[PDB]
Amino acid sequence: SIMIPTHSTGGLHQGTEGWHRTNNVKNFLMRVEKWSLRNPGYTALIAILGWTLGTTTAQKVIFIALLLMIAP
Amino acid sequence: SIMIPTHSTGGLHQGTEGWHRTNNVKNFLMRVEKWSLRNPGYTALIAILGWTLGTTTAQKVIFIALLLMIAP
Amino acid sequence: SIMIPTHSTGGLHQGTEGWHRTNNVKNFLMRVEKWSLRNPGYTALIAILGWTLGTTTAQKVIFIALLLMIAP
Amino acid sequence: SQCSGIDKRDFIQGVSGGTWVDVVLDRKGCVTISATGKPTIDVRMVKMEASNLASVRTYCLEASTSEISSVNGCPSTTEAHNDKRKDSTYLCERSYPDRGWGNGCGLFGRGSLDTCVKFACSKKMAGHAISRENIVITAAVSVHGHSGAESDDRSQRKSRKELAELTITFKSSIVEADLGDYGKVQFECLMDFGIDLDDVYTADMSGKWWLVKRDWYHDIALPWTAPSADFWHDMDRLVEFSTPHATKQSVYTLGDQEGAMSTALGDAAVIEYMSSGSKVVFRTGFLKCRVKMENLRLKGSTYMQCSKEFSILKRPTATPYGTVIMQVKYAQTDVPCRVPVGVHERPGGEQVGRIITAHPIILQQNDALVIEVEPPFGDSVIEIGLGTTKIVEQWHRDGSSIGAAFTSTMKGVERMALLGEHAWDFGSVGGFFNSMGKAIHSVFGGLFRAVFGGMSWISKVLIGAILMWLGVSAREKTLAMSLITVGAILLYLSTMTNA
Amino acid sequence: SQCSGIDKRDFIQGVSGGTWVDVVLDRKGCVTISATGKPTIDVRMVKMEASNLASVRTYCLEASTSEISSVNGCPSTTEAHNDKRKDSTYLCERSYPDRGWGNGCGLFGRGSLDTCVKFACSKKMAGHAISRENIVITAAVSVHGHSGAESDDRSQRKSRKELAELTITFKSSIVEADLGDYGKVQFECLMDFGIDLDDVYTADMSGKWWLVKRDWYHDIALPWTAPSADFWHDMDRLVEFSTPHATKQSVYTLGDQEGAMSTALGDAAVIEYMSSGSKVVFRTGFLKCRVKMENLRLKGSTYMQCSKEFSILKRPTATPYGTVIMQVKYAQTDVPCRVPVGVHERPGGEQVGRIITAHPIILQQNDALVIEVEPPFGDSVIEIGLGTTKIVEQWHRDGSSIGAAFTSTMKGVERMALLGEHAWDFGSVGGFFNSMGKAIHSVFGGLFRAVFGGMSWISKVLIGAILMWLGVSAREKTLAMSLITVGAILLYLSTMTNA
Amino acid sequence: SQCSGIDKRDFIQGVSGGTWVDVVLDRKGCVTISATGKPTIDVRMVKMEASNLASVRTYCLEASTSEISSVNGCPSTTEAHNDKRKDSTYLCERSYPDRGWGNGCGLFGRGSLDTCVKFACSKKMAGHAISRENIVITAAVSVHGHSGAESDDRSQRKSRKELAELTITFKSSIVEADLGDYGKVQFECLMDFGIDLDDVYTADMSGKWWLVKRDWYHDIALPWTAPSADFWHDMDRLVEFSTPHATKQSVYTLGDQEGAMSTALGDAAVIEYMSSGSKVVFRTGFLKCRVKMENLRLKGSTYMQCSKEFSILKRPTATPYGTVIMQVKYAQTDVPCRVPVGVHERPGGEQVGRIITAHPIILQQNDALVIEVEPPFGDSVIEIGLGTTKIVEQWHRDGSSIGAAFTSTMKGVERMALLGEHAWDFGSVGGFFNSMGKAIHSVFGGLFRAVFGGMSWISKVLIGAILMWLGVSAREKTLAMSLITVGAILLYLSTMTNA
């Protein structure tokens, strides 16, 4: 797995996929953005932390992305 | 052994061990940490001595380790 | 036990003693000195470490005493 | 069999010097072998299937806690000890409630409890193990050029010895195809497959099977048992007890976890399971071997050329690759004869393009004859005949050569560049090229590529973006040592390939 | 009862203004209460013993593995599952040997084993729990002065009501002694004892009992069970498994651990166990009774003085404390009468020293009369009699006064300096002294004294030596704050007492 | 015998020039010696066992004090002297109780007691001594290549003289192996074993023998006696007396001490003891025999090649070391004959890899023959036969070369790096390398390695961590002189190996 990535570690991808398997790419982003819009406080705190640390405008993007990934 | 190290001085270690023999290495540490958490006064006194002497932060770890070794 | 102190922490000492209870005080010292005289290399290593560290001749005595006590 | 309808098709030009070419087969892919002076052939592998399975460990999914019991103990130190503790089929755990005067004890403190509940399961993930000496992979080989009646099937094709089949068992790795009068073809391929046996299991859950890893199957937290006789030994992973108020508890399960399992292990390779034989179709492995065309000879070469006129059936149509297909028929009596086929740029001119079929002999009075032709990019005419009554159908094949090169390179870097060291096994190249390529890719797959795994597409794209930004903002010129590790090919693999 | 044969004796002088004095009792110590105008008395604690005990948990010491079994599994993934795994009385463990072609497997790899053994025990450390509402502490009270026949015992002493017995039960904490004509004395002692009940157990091992702590008894690694039935649940601590060579193992025990247990719990208060009643004698705790001397009146005060002469028996002999003891007898017929006793520094001199007995009255013809006298350090004469025929034995009592004060200080710092709060509870002193001492010692015992444990004599001496070294080699005048922590009295306690 | 099924195996390639090779044998390890032009053979160390043992000293574990007696002494000058003190089978000691008037003496002071108690033992730790001239070590030697019927055992193998047995008695240090028509091989090994004889004892406790050191056995504090006749000389180490109140005491034992003994002695080598012969199996020692391959010749070399077809039984399987094993059979009539065996990377390719078996002769009509092959890491094919009907099974052996070298280094530093001086005794090399290594290791073991003792794992890791910290926080470059003292091999031995 839930926090673990999927079971694609075996390197056995092929040209056979279902319609509930290719929907993850957009489903993950949709759920993430829904929770992001429903949660303003954590987003504001993470923005404050990203401006506090780094002071480079290149690492704070990684900070906010990783916080929005540990969170939904 | 009681304060004596084990009888491993003969150098007769081989690939024949029991299932109540290899657990000693972890059982000793479990007992040491349990007594350390159950005994606040001894740990506080040892920390006071380590802070009073040395003032190097490189040997006081050995201080507290040996004091807890003589201690339970 | 040989490292953790005995169960004399209950505060239940009185004027009643058994046949073989008062000999432990000298027995421990006799065992320690026998071990020290039989194994000189460990004592030499401890003395070298105590001379290298501190260089005060006031706390290195406590350090070597603790090392000899924890050593069986 | 016939390799016309498939789009993932490989064309091998053959070897002039030797009589062998190394091919690598996929369950969906197909290759065409065409030497000089020999009839061209098509080889395709049908399926791989194991026969005998060994049980490993059947887990549990849904608990059926049925019977309950309880026993209580006063704050007197003699605690409660349930009798059912000495039965292996009962899950029992002891708790410490807050007993007092209302319960009828006589001393305020904490008591003891012991609630044993009988366990029963309904859904089990029966695992299995595959032996590396039981898979029987089959293949087929066919020869282009032979002509038969309009109404015939694979039975007649095999009867005329033109569709010889293969059974490359784990024991007999050397097989010969009779192929009738055309000679014989032999195969020399190994036990090296894409799947890695002795390292994976099969996870039968509800009729849906998988090929999940052994260690990951071992690390599942669920009540397991022994396949010989089912009785569970890790009962506590699916039964949770409620709050023990006084002299009583309640038993609650945790559901079925079938959805959780099908979601966690929902992207591993999905094998099938054909009953009545306990066979499983792998649909994932490869097969890499080398066809020795030493006894392969043309069937019709002393025949006289066909003279009279043909009749067109199933008018020429294009293929996904871009090679036309036509099915002429013969109705006259000067048979057997060999059909002269050519592809000119203009009527009665030089021959241009490439001819796919080898030598279309006829053998009989009324026979259909599938003809495959690869025309050039420009306008061209396909002439099937000898005299003045010849078939003069023409074609356009609108396309660009640069586009063809782009598609070829993309297909190579997409499909061929996979398979690790197996990438450079489409043929034989001198100058030590293939040898050092395989040698370097051996250690390349030994370390940092296949020594460990754990990459799914989300982590892949995340790490790819991170590495992109790090390389853009890179000092000390680390791109010089970063181009070899992650460049354009691996980034394409992360982005679009391997999907 | 009589307190002459013992050496640990406490002499309380009583308060003239008050009628009560708080005393502290031990199983060996005694206190002599002597006011002015009242008969002096002795109170002694006999024994403490609980009656009803509750079982807690019986451990095991000796393993008696009897039956063995084995089952082997080939490198085929189906592992071995012993059918004796499913019996509560069998210890079973699974291991993986190295099986090969010699054993008769057919493949080279790692097999499986499952060996079960039957568990049994022969020596158990049964525990018990003591309830604070079951101990029946008994004490005795005696009065000085009464004299009976030479051939008398404690039975007749009780019959004459001079050695009344007491049973201080948990419910009847206040009792009265009849004491015959001398009046009546009652007590006010509490339920505060040295042994902190509801926090300790009794560890019976082989008929030798103890008073070991609850948590330490809980934290022993040994195969335990329930007191109701020996149903072992931690069987693996006494059974070891040898190396699994091939399809066979061997099992070994680990001895008895009785010696190790008797060494570890080798310093706890060794309580006794009186059978035929299941009583256990504590021999450790105290009892702080408060004698209320309100109805304590002299028996013979209207009797006339004894005129004639006595006969001496058991010529005066010194006691370990240093008090003379005599036994005079009367043979004439002017009885009952009050015997005159005097202690002068010279025959016919002023009265010096202290007289212990109050009123040696007779009541019969031929009675033996025990007389105790505490002479001064110098020469003195002990005169018994009235007329010209009087017993005039004299004594030296060679000793110094400063030495006596030093011995008193040493015995104080030995006895009363212990017990914590009970240190300043030997009497009533005004000026808020004792009240403030108890108030500060309450928190002094709540924290830094009983908040932690795990200290023995060798640890005491090592840490103490560290303390003097670090105090001598100290700056910033930390000795001012260290004298309260560790000073001279605590150094004496670490060195000589508490041994 | 056969050394295929064991995981730990050593391969020696022999010397073309010389005819002798020095090998070291272990209870579990085995070595394969194969010279060029000689049949390879396998030598295995079977067991060691002493024959006759001499007793040293039998300690006592569980006292059985049975009879007691007491005698009291008044404060008179004469003390108590029990007449049982004149007996050597009684434990007796004297105390001074507190005697007074109530006991019945007549004078206050300190009395005297002296109580005798009888001693008796029930459990004894019977020691023993091993003579360095009685060890009878046996070894077995087998020859690769011979083939017999599938229904045969070790009895038939020895009857055909292919499994010659050896018994290296303490007297006959050089013994020749029969080996049948293959010739004869002799050993030369001396009497240098890992364990230091005449410096250890065998401490039987309850049927579980050990190998304790002589001084440590002499140092244990327990009541001991003489092996011939029981006469206990330290009776006071297991019997204790309670507090001597008055004219009476009680005697207490101290349990069994068996658990304490088995805990203190818990890691020393656990030798076995086979009854009916009083033999003790050692399972710990080594044996360093140099194999003289002078009279070793191939049995079948003038036979003709086998031309017919072979039948495959027990299809090739991998071994833990990585060498495949197969068992072909011959059923034709052109026997006896020599079987041609080769290993190519491709059917009809060059010979690569390395063969193990020397000359697979047949000698029978129907028989089975075991073939052992060591293939290279890449793909390869194993050919069994001569003509067009040959066994052409192929193998993969997925593995890397750098990994193989690194694992070989691990094996060397684990097993070979032990044994002290014998570390460099796997063969003979020029340039004085091995001789100089032995010379330096002689003094390196004489001082600083074996002149000192008293190291266990916990002390070793503590000292190792201390050395890490000291070396890291050091100047003057003492690590240059410390790498010889404590480098990487010694620290790796401390942390991972020798465990």
Side-chain angles (χ1 to χ4, degrees), chain F residues 145-152 157 160 306 309-314 326-339 360-371 384:
Chain F
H146 213 281
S147 52
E150 65 277 42
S151 64
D152 65 343
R157 215 81 40 81
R160 304 200 308 254
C306 319
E309 211 218 326
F310 292 87
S311 154
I312 288 284
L313 313 163
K314 283 156 144 185
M326 41 206 299
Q327 174 168 316
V328 313
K329 106 183 292 286
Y330 202 92
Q332 280 84 316
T333 57
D334 72 324
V335 280
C337 67
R338 156 186 32 187
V339 169
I361 40 186
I362 292 301
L363 301 61
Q364 282 286 280
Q365 169 75 25
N366 311 319
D367 46 273
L369 182 173
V370 188
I371 306 179
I384 298 314

Side-chain angles (χ1 to χ4, degrees), chain D residues 288-333:
Chain D
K288 37 197 311 181
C289 45
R290 94 155 41 210
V291 281
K292 278 187 232 303
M293 339 172 61
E294 278 135 11
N295 304 56
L296 211 45
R297 60 174 180 264
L298 285 139
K299 168 165 186 53
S301 154
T302 78
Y303 293 145
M304 252 165 272
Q305 311 213 316
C306 309
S307 85
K308 310 212 184 48
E309 59 155 41
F310 294 85
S311 158
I312 274 280
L313 316 170
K314 294 202 197 53
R315 172 163 312 274
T317 61
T319 47
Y321 179 4
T323 72
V324 305
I325 303 208
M326 177 195 354
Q327 183 174 323
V328 315
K329 102 184 287 281
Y330 205 90
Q332 285 81 305
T333 62

Side-chain angles (χ1 to χ4, degrees), chain D residues 171-174 188-192 290 443 446, chain F residues 315 345-347 379-380 392-396 400 402:
Chain D
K171 156 190 327 180
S172 88
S173 180
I174 293 174
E188 312 298 7
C189 52
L190 312 93
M191 311 325 268
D192 163 12
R290 94 155 41 210
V443 304
Chain F
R315 191 156 322 283
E345 63 178 61
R346 187 165 300 106
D379 205 51
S380 304
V392 59
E393 321 301 356
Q394 41 203 137
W395 200 258
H396 192 172
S400 306
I402 320 165

Side-chain angles (χ1 to χ4, degrees), chain E residues 287-302:
Chain E
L287 166 86
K288 339 212 311 192
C289 275
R290 162 168 282 195
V291 281
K292 232 196 301 293
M293 290 141 31
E294 291 156 340
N295 305 8
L296 208 49
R297 62 171 182 264
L298 284 139
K299 169 170 189 52
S301 156
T302 77

Side-chain angles (χ1 to χ4, degrees), chain E residues 112-131 134-161 163-169 171-183 185-197 199-232 234-271 273 275-326:
Chain E
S112 80
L113 252 175
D114 213 35
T115 50
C116 311
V117 279
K118 158 119 67 177
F119 200 98
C121 194
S122 58
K123 285 205 271 132
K124 37 188 71 175
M125 181 215 288
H128 284 310
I130 308 178
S131 45
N134 274 336
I135 50 190
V136 183
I137 170 175
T138 85
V141 52
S142 99
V143 59
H144 291 177
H146 212 280
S147 52
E150 286 190 69
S151 61
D152 67 356
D153 39 356
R154 269 89 195 191
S155 163
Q156 278 138 3
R157 213 81 50 75
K158 269 174 202 43
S159 172
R160 298 197 306 253
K161 293 185 193 308
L163 199 79
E165 271 301 355
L166 285 194
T167 63
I168 299 180
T169 314
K171 55 202 67 34
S172 87
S173 170
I174 286 168
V175 277
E176 290 220 328
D178 207 8
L179 263 192
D181 284 295
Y182 292 79
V185 183
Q186 55 292 77
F187 296 75
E188 193 258 355
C189 35
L190 331 170
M191 311 315 258
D192 158 20
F193 306 143
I195 318 174
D196 177 24
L197 285 176
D199 200 76
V200 298
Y201 291 143
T202 85
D204 177 4
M205 226 153 71
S206 36
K208 296 183 284 222
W209 293 53
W210 270 276
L211 211 53
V212 64
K213 283 206 171 172
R214 261 180 188 194
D215 71 87
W216 182 100
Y217 185 82
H218 265 311
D219 295 8
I220 285 179
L222 272 187
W224 56 270
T225 183
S228 301
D230 47 323
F231 281 33
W232 310 102
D234 206 330
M235 343 179 77
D236 89 10
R237 304 291 221 300
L238 280 200
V239 176
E240 76 155 342
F241 281 113
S242 49
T243 202
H245 47 274
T247 81
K248 192 151 287 193
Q249 291 192 280
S250 83
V251 300
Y252 280 134
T253 179
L254 269 81
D256 289 26
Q257 258 77 15
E258 177 162 323
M261 262 315 115
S262 80
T263 280
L265 66 84
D267 70 273
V270 190
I271 84 173
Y273 175 82
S275 172
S276 90
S278 66
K279 334 201 284 292
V280 300
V281 183
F282 286 173
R283 85 175 53 165
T284 319
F286 332 126
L287 166 86
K288 339 212 311 192
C289 275
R290 162 168 282 195
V291 281
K292 232 196 301 293
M293 290 141 31
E294 291 156 340
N295 305 8
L296 208 49
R297 62 171 182 264
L298 284 139
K299 169 170 189 52
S301 156
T302 77
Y303 298 145
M304 26 178 45
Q305 291 268 31
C306 314
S307 87
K308 312 213 185 49
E309 84 165 71
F310 308 87
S311 156
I312 187 76
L313 319 162
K314 293 195 189 293
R315 177 152 320 284
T317 56
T319 49
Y321 194 10
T323 79
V324 202
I325 281 279
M326 332 173 59

